[PDB]
Amino acid sequence: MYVKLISSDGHEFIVKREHALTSGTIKAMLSGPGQFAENETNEVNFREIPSHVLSKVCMYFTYKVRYTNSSTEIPEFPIAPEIALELLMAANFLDC
Amino acid sequence: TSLKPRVVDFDETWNKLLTTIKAVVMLEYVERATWNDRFSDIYALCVAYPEPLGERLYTETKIFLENHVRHLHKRVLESEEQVLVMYHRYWEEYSKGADYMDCLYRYLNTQFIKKNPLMEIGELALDMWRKLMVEPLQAILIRM
Amino acid sequence: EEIRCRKYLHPSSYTKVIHECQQRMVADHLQFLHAECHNIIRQEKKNDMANMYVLLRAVSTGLPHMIQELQNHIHDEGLRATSNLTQENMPTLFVESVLEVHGKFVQLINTVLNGDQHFMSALDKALTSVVNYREPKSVCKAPELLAKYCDNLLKKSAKGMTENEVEDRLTSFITVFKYIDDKDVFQKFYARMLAKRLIHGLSMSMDSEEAMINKLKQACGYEFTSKLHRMYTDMSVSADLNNKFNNFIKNQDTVIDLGISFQIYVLQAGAWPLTQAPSSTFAIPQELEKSVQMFELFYSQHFSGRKLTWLHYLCTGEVKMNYLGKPYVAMVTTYQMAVLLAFNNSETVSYKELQDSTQMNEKELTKTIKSLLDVKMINHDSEKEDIDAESSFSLNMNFSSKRTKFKITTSMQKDTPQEMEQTRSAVDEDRKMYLQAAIVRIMKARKVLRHNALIQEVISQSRARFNPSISMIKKCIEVLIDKQYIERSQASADEYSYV
Amino acid sequence: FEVKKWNAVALWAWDIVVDNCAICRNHIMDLCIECQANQASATSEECTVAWGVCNHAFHFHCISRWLKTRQVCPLDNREWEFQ
Amino acid sequence: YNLIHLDPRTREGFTLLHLAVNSNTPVDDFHTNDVCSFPNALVTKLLLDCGAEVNAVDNEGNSALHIIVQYNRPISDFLTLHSIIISLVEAGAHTDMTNKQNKTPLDKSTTGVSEILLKTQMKMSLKCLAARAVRANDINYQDQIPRTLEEFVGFH
Ligand SMILES: [Zn+2]
Ligand SMILES: [Zn+2]
Ligand SMILES: [Zn+2]
Numbered sequence: 001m002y003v004k005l006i007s008s009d010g011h012e013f014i015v016k017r018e019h020a021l022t023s024g025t026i027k028a029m030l031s032g033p034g035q036f037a038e039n040e041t042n043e044v045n046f047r048e049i050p051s052h053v054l055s056k057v058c059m060y061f062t063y064k065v066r067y068t069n070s071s072t073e074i075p076e077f078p079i080a081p082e083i084a085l086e087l088l089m090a091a092n093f094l095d096c
Numbered sequence: 097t098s099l100k101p102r103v104v105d106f107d108e109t110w111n112k113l114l115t116t117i118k119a120v121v122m123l124e125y126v127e128r129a130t131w132n133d134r135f136s137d138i139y140a141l142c143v144a145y146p147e148p149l150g151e152r153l154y155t156e157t158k159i160f161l162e163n164h165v166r167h168l169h170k171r172v173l174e175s176e177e178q179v180l181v182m183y184h185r186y187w188e189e190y191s192k193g194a195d196y197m198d199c200l201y202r203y204l205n206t207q208f209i210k211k212n213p214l215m216e217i218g219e220l221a222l223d224m225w226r227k228l229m230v231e232p233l234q235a236i237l238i239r240m
Numbered sequence: 241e242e243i244r245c246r247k248y249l250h251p252s253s254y255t256k257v258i259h260e261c262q263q264r265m266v267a268d269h270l271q272f273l274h275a276e277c278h279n280i281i282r283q284e285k286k287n288d289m290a291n292m293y294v295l296l297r298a299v300s301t302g303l304p305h306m307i308q309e310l311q312n313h314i315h316d317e318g319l320r321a322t323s324n325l326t327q328e329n330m331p332t333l334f335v336e337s338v339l340e341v342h343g344k345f346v347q348l349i350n351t352v353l354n355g356d357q358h359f360m361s362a363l364d365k366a367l368t369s370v371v372n373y374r375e376p377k378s379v380c381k382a383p384e385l386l387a388k389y390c391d392n393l394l395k396k397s398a399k400g401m402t403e404n405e406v407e408d409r410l411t412s413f414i415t416v417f418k419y420i421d422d423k424d425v426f427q428k429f430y431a432r433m434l435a436k437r438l439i440h441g442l443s444m445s446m447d448s449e450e451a452m453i454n455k456l457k458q459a460c461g462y463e464f465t466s467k468l469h470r471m472y473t474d475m476s477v478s479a480d481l482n483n484k485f486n487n488f489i490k491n492q493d494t495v496i497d498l499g500i501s502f503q504i505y506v507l508q509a510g511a512w513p514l515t516q517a518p519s520s521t522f523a524i525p526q527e528l529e530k531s532v533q534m535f536e537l538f539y540s541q542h543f544s545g546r547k548l549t550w551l552h553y554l555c556t557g558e559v560k561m562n563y564l565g566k567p568y569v570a571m572v573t574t575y576q577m578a579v580l581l582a583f584n585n586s587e588t589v590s591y592k593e594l595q596d597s598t599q600m601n602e603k604e605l606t607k608t609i610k611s612l613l614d615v616k617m618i619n620h621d622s623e624k625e626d627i628d629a630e631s632s633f634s635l636n637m638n639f640s641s642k643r644t645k646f647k648i649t650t651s652m653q654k655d656t657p658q659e660m661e662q663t664r665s666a667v668d669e670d671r672k673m674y675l676q677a678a679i680v681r682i683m684k685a686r687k688v689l690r691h692n693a694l695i696q697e698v699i700s701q702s703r704a705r706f707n708p709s710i711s712m713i714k715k716c717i718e719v720l721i722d723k724q725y726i727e728r729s730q731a732s733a734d735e736y737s738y739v
Numbered sequence: 740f741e742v743k744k745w746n747a748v749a750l751w752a753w754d755i756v757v758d759n760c761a762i763c764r765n766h767i768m769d770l771c772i773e774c775q776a777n778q779a780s781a782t783s784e785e786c787t788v789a790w791g792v793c794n795h796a797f798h799f800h801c802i803s804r805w806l807k808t809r810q811v812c813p814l815d816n817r818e819w820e821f822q
Numbered sequence: 823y824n825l826i827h828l829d830p831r832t833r834e835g836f837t838l839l840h841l842a843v844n845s846n847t848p849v850d851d852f853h854t855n856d857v858c859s860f861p862n863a864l865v866t867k868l869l870l871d872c873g874a875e876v877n878a879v880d881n882e883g884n885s886a887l888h889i890i891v892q893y894n895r896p897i898s899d900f901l902t903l904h905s906i907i908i909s910l911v912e913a914g915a916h917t918d919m920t921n922k923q924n925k926t927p928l929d930k931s932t933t934g935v936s937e938i939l940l941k942t943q944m945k946m947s948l949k950c951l952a953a954r955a956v957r958a959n960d961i962n963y964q965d966q967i968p969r970t971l972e973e974f975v976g977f978h
Contacts, residue, residue: 008097022946025135025202032196033120034131045132048099048139057948064946071941077951084955085963089099091948092971093139095206101968103762103805103813115685143968145805145813146762147772163700167693207970210914213823213873235301439748466759466766473769477783501744508768509750510758527742539751545790549750557745569743584740808965 003030003042005058011051017042019061024095053090056083060091101145106152109137114160120200121164121193121221134200142203150208154217157201161221165190165228173233180240183233187225194221267299274305281306281313290352303358311362314345318370331388338416342367364419371419372707379664383426386417390452391433396444406448414455423460424706428513428667430456431467433655435512438475439505439554440653446476470511478505488538498531500557509549513666516551520600523578556649563635570646575608580617588621588634609633615648671706675716678702683726683738691734755794761814762801771798792820823872835880842866843890843906861890863905870913877914877977883921884930886910887940891927896935904939911943918950919977953978 003020005013021027029044036042046054060077067074079087116134119126142150168190172182198205198218205216215223230237245257266273273296280288296302321337342363349359374380390413393406420426437443453472457465482503489496507514524532532550539546552574559572559580572580578598582589591605598605606627612618613625616639621632675698682697683689689697695713702708720726729735759765763772767788774781789799793812797805805813812819831837841847847860866886870876879885887910893903911917917940918926931937953975956963963975 024206028199028202029132029135031199032131033126034128036128043128045129047133047136048097050098060946060948060951064948068946071938077948079951079955081955081959081961084952084959085961085966086099088949088952088956088963088967088971088975091952092207092968092974093099093203094948095202096945096947096949097816100809100966105761111681111685118686145965146801148969160700163696167696207968211970462765466769470766470768500742502747503744504747504749506749506751509752510756512750514748514750528745531745532747535747535749543751545754546751547754549752551748551750555746555748558743560741560743562740580740804965 001039001042003044005054006043006045007049007051007054008047009051011054013051013054013058015058015061019058019065022061022064022096023057026094049090049093050086053083053086056087057090057094099139099143101143102140103145104140104149106141106144106149106156109141110153110156113137113141117157117160117197117200118164120196121161121190123189123192131200135202138201139203142208148208150204153204154208154214157197157217158220158224161224162228165224169229169232172229173236177240179233179236183229183237186229190221190225194218194225197221262298266295267302270296270299270302273302277306278309281309284348286348286352293353293356307358307362310359311366314341314363314366315369317341318366319373322370323373329392331385331392334382334385335389335413335416338367338371338419339412341370342415367416367419368421371416372421380422380425383420383422384429384660386413386420387426387429387433389413390430391437394444394448394452395437395442401444403445403448406445407451410452410455414459417456417459422706423464424671425664425667427464427468427705428663428670431471432513432663434468434471435514436653436655438471442653446472467511470508474507474511475505478507481506485535485538488542489534496530496534498534499527500531502531502535504535505555514551514554516549516553518601518604520552520604522550522552522575523597523599525577525581528577564637564640567641568644568646570641571649573611573649573652575604576612579608579612583618583635588632590630590632592630594633611648611651671702671708672716672719674705675702675708675713676719679716679720680725683720683736687738689736691736694736753796755796757794757796760797760801761795762797762805765798767796767798771800773800773804774798790822792822793817826869826872826874829875832880835882837875837878837880839866839869839874839876839878839886840880840884840889842869843886843910845893845895861893861902861906863902863909866906867909870909874913876910877916877919879919879921881922883923885915885919885921885927887915887917887919887927888921888925888930891931891933891936891940893933893936896933900935903936907936907939907943916950916977917944918947918954949974950978 001017002014003017003026005015005020005026007013021030026044030042034044049057056079063077113134116126116130118124138153141153142148168186172179172186175182195218198216198221201217205218208214209216241261242258245254249257273292277292277296280292292306293303296306318338318341321341322334325333325337345363346360349355349363353359371382372380373382393401393409417426434449438449443449450472453465453469456468485502485504489498536548539548555574556571557574557577558569559577561567561570563584579594582594582597586593594605609618609627613620616636618633619636619639621634622630624631678698678701679694682694682701686697694717695710698713699708717726724739726736727739729737757767760767760771765772765775769775770781770783770786774786785800787799788796789802790796791802791812793815795812795814797813802813802819806819810819811817826838829837832841836844841860842865843861845861849855849858849860877885887907890903890906890910893899896903917928920926921930927940928937931940953971956975957978963972967975
């Protein structure tokens with residue numbers, strides 16, 4: 001219910017469950033034979049997403065779940081030039 | 097590694113994936129490390145450089161599933177009067193297996209199948225269950 | 241009733257009524273229809289067959305019996321039309337019979353039976369069963385027949401085989417080829433006779449051969465036509481390579497007049513099946529050793545990292561027989577270049593005088609000598625015509641050639657029947673190794689399997705090229721047992737555990 | 740005697756035996772998939788074998804386009820240097 | 823299915839879906855205008871059923887969404903309009919797609935009803951934000967992203 005996102009560098013990125021279930025494939029990883037309904041770790045390992053990209057992905061999770069119902073000129077998500085084109089593959093692999 | 101499109105030999109990654117896939121349809125045990133690595137395997141297969149092996153992955157998983165429901169059919173049909181309980185056990189395994197494979201084939205279902213008369217993996221496994229388990233046993237199953 | 245319920249009822253009752261019109265009229269008498277269904281198909285009454293189809297289609301369990309009966313009828317018709325053929329033009333007649341059966345039943349299904357895909361699948365299964373019809377405890381002959389059909393139609397002959405019909409006959413041939421289900425045998429046989437057709441120039445059209453290669457590629461993926469396409473590309477590139485060697489020799493500082501014309505057909509060793517099984521140390525003559533060493537230097541200078549494996553049992557030549565007062569010109573094979581060189585120095589030679597000039601096994605020597613004794617270039621000095629220890633030989637002074645272009649290698653372009661069984665054994669051991677690798681992969685990957693399930697898993701991956709028999713995969717299992725790759729589980733012999 | 744002309748046949752194989760370009764999955768001596776189309780523009784000689792330090796072989800077009808954006812040998816993840 | 827698979831395109835790039843979701847598609851003076859009117863929810867749903875290219879782009883850069891949001895009768899025929907939008911969203915129409923003038927369908931709404939319908943039919947879609955960042959910063963996205971992501975970036 002507090003899941004842990006681990007990047008390719010070992011950087012743990014512990015984030016809330018409903019925050020991390022916005023991405024479809026994280027929901028898929030936590031589903032199936034990946035549940036372990038014991039509320040102990042809920043660990044998902046990202047062998048490919050770098051830490052500087054998974055951090056932006058988690059910040060996007062929080063930003064989306066905060067501004068999902070505003071529709072009143074939400075602030076722009078700050079994406080650096082270098083994070084883009086690497087945040088894009090992360091947002092594809094982690095759908096939405 | 098990274099999420100860039102690399103080149104992956106389909107035989108190696110598909111043999112790595114089939115060990116997990118075969119343990120999911122029949123509800124065996126697979127580790128978090130393996131179950132999470134198979135998502136990266138499917139992503140690499142559906143993105144593989146220079147041409148994506150998404151259609152190859154779908155064809156091979158369809159071939160596997162039709163070669164798996166046939167085995168369950170031969171195992172259930174050989175039961176004379178226990179065909180109802182064997183069919184129920186195999187269906188209780190296979191429905192959850194199909195749901196879990198629909199979960200695991202998320203990238204193939206979204207980025208490839210919906211992007212294109214193809215059938216989603218969760219829909220394919222169930223539709224192939226009726227075509228290879230229920231329809232051949234339609235005259236038999238209802239009879240008792 | 242459809243018209244009557246149209247002008248008498250609410251829309252919501254349009255279907256239900258006709259459903260009750262069917263279940264009481266066609267479904268309740270299914271046993272009457274199905275018992276007649278068999279007799280409908282065998283005599284091929286299209287008027288009755290269409291109505292039977294459109295009636296049984298409404299009933300839930302009426303169609304599959306008709307599908308099975310049509311499949312059985314097509315299978316029996318195929319056996320009747322294909323099993324009576326006896327040699328003559330058997331490879332062509334088998335393909336023509338299967339094509340005629342397929343063409344008849346495709347238009348029968350399309351025109352009469354709504355073009356239903358279930359009956360199309362029944363037709364496909366029936367043709368798969370009839371094509372692979374093998375005699376009990378025998379070997380299937382369909383891939384050999386189809387490969388011989390391709391070899392017969394694609395060869396260069398003056399029998400009026402025009403070019404403008406082959407490229408559309410082969411599209412029809414692909415239909416019978418798709419039902420082989422033993423495609424490894426056909427691939428190997430077609431590779432062998434493609435090598436024979438391309439080396440000797442027997443191909444009637446290079447573009448037609450390339451059309452064959454592309455048709456097989458479209459039929460069975462790229463990896464089916466890998467070696468075939470490399471064969472074709474090698475034969476197409478060899479002319480340009482000969483042209484390149486034509487000016488490489490003049491580009492040297494010293495003009496080396498070799499005295500012979502060079503037409504090398506350099507080929508990929510990983511594609512062509514040309515394997516030199518014995519040692520057979522060829523004693524290259526003085527007129528060819530300089531050429532072969534200079535060509536080896538050419539590849540050592542131009543095409544780096546390309547080892548040469550010279551085989552001399554596919555190359556020919558012409559040698560000026562000036563000792564017989566020029567009785568025309570003869571085309572001859574390479575292995576007896578040694579045999580005739582010792583005759584240049586001494587008129588009479590023996591095995592002692594020829595062993596030092598050849599230096600290989602006696603099996604090659606005996607056959608290469610008999611290749612000249614029968615055609616009467618070499619006569620036996622003594623009365624002992626059979627092969628003995630001494631076996632004195634002499635050049636036939638009195639005999640003279642009659643044909644202007646005397647060819648002694650006619651025996652060469654004949655696909656002897658004995659090498660067919662050798663290729664069959666090669667295919668058998670190739671698929672044995674393939675199944676060895678398949679079982680090793682599955683067993684290592686899964687770490688637990690049953691005896692009745694492991695065979696199914698092996699078939700699942702081996703369906704792509706051939707049909708593995710249950711008895712022969714059983715023999716394959718004990719081969720892994722011998723190689724300590726697998727053993728029977730202690731609790732039960734059904735289970736297997738990797739070690 | 741003397742020979743007016745001699746036909747010859749020889750099989751060649753690489754010292755380092757490798758079968759197909761792992762990028763395009765076509766055989767190395769076959770045309771690459773990029774040059775397998777539009778055969779009119781291609782002269783069937785541009786698809787030269789491109790070896791490397793890692794003892795791997797690819798079509799020149801395949802490895803040239805792979806090195807356009809990346810700098811890593813496809814199969815074995817090391818620095819790619821032409822040999 | 824066969825018709826769209828042979829790709830029929832009007833001289834202005836208007837595919838079958840664009841004409842099905844457009845109120846500017848002419849209807850002759852016969853009894854057709856009493857029955858067949860455009861845009862049609864049922865016709866759009868039928869086209870989306872038979873494998874129509876939902877994200878098809880005409881010469882002006884517009885798509886089916888860019889055309890349906892410009893509907894001039896957004897209340898009286900609201901349901902039809904509403905249905906069409908969700909149909910497009912149910913068939914993978916990208917709500918962030920920019921035309922040749924770089925106008926998202928919200929910038930081409932010209933209507934409060936269509937604007938809020940499309941706003942309620944979106945998702946936040948970090949893919950869209952990353953693609954917008956890539957497009958705005960002129961980063962060369964050739965061969966460094968998946969094959970589908972190239973046209974995804976080309977959308978924005
Ligand atoms: Zn290549
Ligand atoms: Zn090329
Ligand atoms: Zn390497």
